[PDB]
């Protein structure tokens, strides 16, 4: 359910901007039947937004390359070779995640305390 919250939250703000963008278009026509400088920001905004989506595409592409290049190696070893050994891997992973979390935690705590510092320095 908690995961379902964020879903609606996204869907809420989405229909609301689509409500306004679809409203800004009719008021222009309702004005005509009886704002041109405004939609420019909207189009340029969509452009500015997509401009990064393209960069995301590039990123993901580069990743896919970098990944399949690994797949090749995995298969290249798997062909070359041709249970209990991998169980150690899981443990080796988890014991490392513990450490990574414990690493991140420090950063988080540092930030939080770092913010409360300024918060304090504000009314102090």
């Amino acid at each position: 359910l908690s995961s379902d919250i964020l879903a609606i939250d996204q869907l809420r703000e989405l229909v609301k901007q689509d409500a306004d963008n679809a409203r800004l278009s009719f008021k222009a026509i309702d004005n005509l039947k009886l704002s041109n400088a405004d939609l420019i920001s909207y189009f340029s905004k969509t452009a500015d937004e997509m401009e990064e989506m393209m960069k995301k595409f590039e990123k993901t592409i580069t990743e896919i390359e970098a990944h399949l290049t690994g797949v090749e190696a995995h298969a290249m070893a798997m062909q070359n070779v041709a249970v209990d050994e991998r169980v150690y891997e899981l443990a080796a992973v988890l014991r490392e995640f513990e450490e990574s979390i414990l690493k991140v935690a420090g950063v988080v705590g540092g930030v939080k305390e770092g913010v409360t510092e300024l918060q304090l320095r504000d009314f102090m």
Binding site: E63, A73, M78, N80, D84, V87, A91, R95
Partner: protein, 636 residues
């Protein structure tokens, strides 16, 4: 003018040649053959630059456009599965022949130095090449949903067909070609989006060109169109139990590249989808079992570098390394394949599972590692065995350093006496034992490939020493002398099951200044002496940075018109000596850093041993004096 405007007659003829399969495949093959240059499979794109200049046509684009439209739309009117497979194979071969004929490094160096350093004369050539080459149109089509849907439909097939099919079946070849096209697209997407789209857009804005877009703006990258398919990874994993070396390597490389990306793992784990997709009908278990059965398969001593089994093993190891190195804090598919219960920010083991019964991928790796002998007689100190064990040790270190998978791994290792097997598998190094039939003191050693095996062996020894030190520290802090006695006995040189082994002081034979890795014989270099390695340089001296400089200097000297023909061989041999000089310097730096890491690991191990030692000191005085004698010359 086939006997009505040309723009209409051409499309009418294309549509007429689209009805059926025989004529379509024949036309596709004819186009593929025509796209091959006369010199065979880099400039002079294989087609006239004035192709279609008379009529208002974009050149050779209509052909690729029609081919893609056919392959995307008219693939449902083929009832005979064989005809559909043949058509898909022909289309994939056409796409590959179109993509492989694109210059990447040329365009990179052009966009880098042509307009910024070089004149503006050759710029027109590169512009025309980028505008007329169909690579841009192919890349634009790759961002379409129809193409990826057809691809994943072709790759998604029943297993019984591939099992009963022949190795030369058209389905396997088509799947291989599709995987290769996907790999090439994932590799060249960045280069395209960087050095194609802006130039093409600027040209279309400046001049007058009428083109129809066939790409989706929403799909900012190639991963956006494929992240919506969950059965792809399942099919790729199931296709590993077929035995086809090429297909297995291709699938492993594809999975490695997928795991290496970022958007895919951000969409999967923003709970998760892959862990639940691979745990539908026990796919992970069968995948792990197949991988174990594969890695356990022996290799051909004669076909060391040609054994498909060894290639598959190395591919699997590289895949695991890339999957574990990327995002170590958060679990991944590697943890599930090893036999762990991948839970949200937590792992665990299940009762009676494959990893609990010591029958999993990790245990198989441990077995194949402890049952591996590198000490040979005919050659001695092989190279590919060293590489295999180095990859295994890197994977083990990546699994250990991760605190999320550290405690259980250390427990499973200490519960099977892994350090004892490693010590029993150790071998002493001396300046007499050659590496692959080649001696170390030889000058060609620094130029040969034995340096890689030597660095790998040094790293393996360092990792083993670090693991031994960590285990000793753990056993000491656990205040249990049950294992301390065995540890000391192994360090004393005896084993009570007595089997003897060389002590730690015996392995202190890697510090040797007789080779003079720091000193280098500097030739005379009467010419090119002023050419330094400034722009070459993480000590990594690039060779192209000096190659370009020496080429410019040779061109200037030739333009000077002063004994250019005679003194050319001098510059040639000076360059041939400088390249080997750079390679030798790089190898020496690598060996030096490896020796430094090994010495640091040995010092840490010795410190941990001396500090955590409750045993009497009067008996260990002998080892103390031996260590003092050994370090005396090192310090001197």
């Amino acid at each position: 003018n086939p006997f009505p405007g040309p723009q209409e007659c051409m499309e009418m003829m294309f549509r007429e040649f689209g009805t059926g399969f025989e004529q379509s495949n024949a036309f596709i093959q004819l186009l593929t053959t025509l796209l091959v240059p006369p010199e065979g499979l880099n400039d002079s794109v294989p087609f006239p630059e004035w192709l279609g200049s008379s009529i208002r046509t974009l050149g050779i684009e209509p052909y690729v456009d029609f081919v893609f439209d056919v392959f995307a739309n008219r693939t449902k009117d083929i009832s005979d599965p064989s005809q559909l497979r043949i058509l898909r194979l022909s289309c994939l071969d056409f796409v590959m022949v179109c993509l492989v004929t694109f210059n990447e490094d040329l365009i990179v160096l052009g966009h880098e130095s042509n307009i910024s350093i070089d004149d503006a004369m050759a710029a027109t050539n590169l512009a025309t090449y980028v505008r007329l080459h169909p690579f841009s149109r192919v890349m634009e089509w790759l961002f379409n949903e129809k193409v990826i849907t057809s691809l994943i439909n072709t790759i998604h097939q029943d297993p019984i067909s591939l099992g009963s099919a022949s190795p030369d079946s058209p389905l396997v070849v088509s799947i291989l070609r599709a995987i290769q096209v996907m790999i090439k697209a994932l590799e060249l997407q960045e280069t395209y989006l960087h050095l194609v789209r802006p130039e093409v857009l600027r040209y279309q804005g400046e001049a007058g060109v009428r083109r129809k877009p066939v790409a989706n703006a929403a799909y900012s990258a190639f991963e956006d169109g494929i992240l919506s398919h969950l059965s792809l990874v399942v099919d790729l994993g199931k296709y590993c139990n077929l035995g086809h070396a090429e297909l297995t390597l291709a699938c492993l490389k594809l999975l490695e590249k997928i795991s290496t990306s970022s958007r895919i793992l951000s969409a999967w784990s923003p709970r998760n989808k892959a862990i639940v997709q691979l745990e539908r009908n026990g796919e992970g278990e069968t995948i792990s079992a197949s991988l174990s059965a594969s890695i356990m398969a022996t290799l051909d001593p004669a076909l060391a570098a040609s054994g498909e089994n060894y290639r598959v093993k190395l591919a699997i190891l590289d895949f695991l390394y890339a999957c574990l190195r990327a995002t170590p804090d958060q679990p991944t598919i590697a943890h599930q394949l090893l036999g762990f219960h991948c839970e949200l920010s937590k792992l665990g083991i299940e009762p009676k599972g494959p990893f609990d019964m010591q029958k999993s991928l990790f245990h198989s790796l441990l077995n194949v590692l402890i049952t591996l002998t590198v000490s040979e007689e005919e050659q001695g100190m092989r190279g590919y065995l060293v590489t295999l064990k180095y990859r295994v040790l890197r994977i083990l270190q990546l699994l250990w350093k991760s605190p999320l998978s550290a405690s259980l791994v250390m427990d499973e290792l200490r519960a099977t006496n892994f350090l004892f097997h490693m010590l029993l598998r150790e071998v002493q190094i001396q300046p007499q034992l050659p590496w692959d039939g080649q001696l170390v003191t030889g000058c060609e050693f620094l130029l040969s490939d034995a340096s890689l095996a030597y660095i790998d062996y040094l790293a393996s020894r360092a990792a083993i020493f670090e693991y031994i030190g960590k285990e000793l520290c753990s056993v000491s802090q656990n205040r249990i002398p049950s294992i301390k006695r065995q540890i000391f006995d192994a360090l004393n040189g005896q084993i009570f099951v007595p089997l003897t082994i060389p002590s730690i002081f015996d392995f202190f034979d890697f510090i040797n200044t007789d080779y003079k890795w720091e000193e280098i014989p500097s030739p005379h270099f009467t010419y090119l002496k002023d050419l330094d390695l400034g722009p070459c340089i993480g000590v990594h001296y690039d060779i192209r940075k000096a190659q370009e400089i020496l080429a410019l200097k040779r061109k200037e000297y030739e333009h000077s018109q002063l004994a250019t023909p005679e003194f050319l061989e001098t510059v040639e041999l000076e360059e041939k000596v400088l390249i080997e000089w750079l390679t030798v310097r790089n190898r020496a730096n690598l060996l030096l850093t490896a020796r430094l890491n090994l010495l640091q690991a040995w010092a840490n191990l010795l410190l941990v041993m001396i500090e955590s030692n409750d045993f009497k000191s009067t008996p260990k005085m002998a080892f103390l004096l031996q260590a003092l004698q050994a370090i005396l010359p090192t310090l001197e």
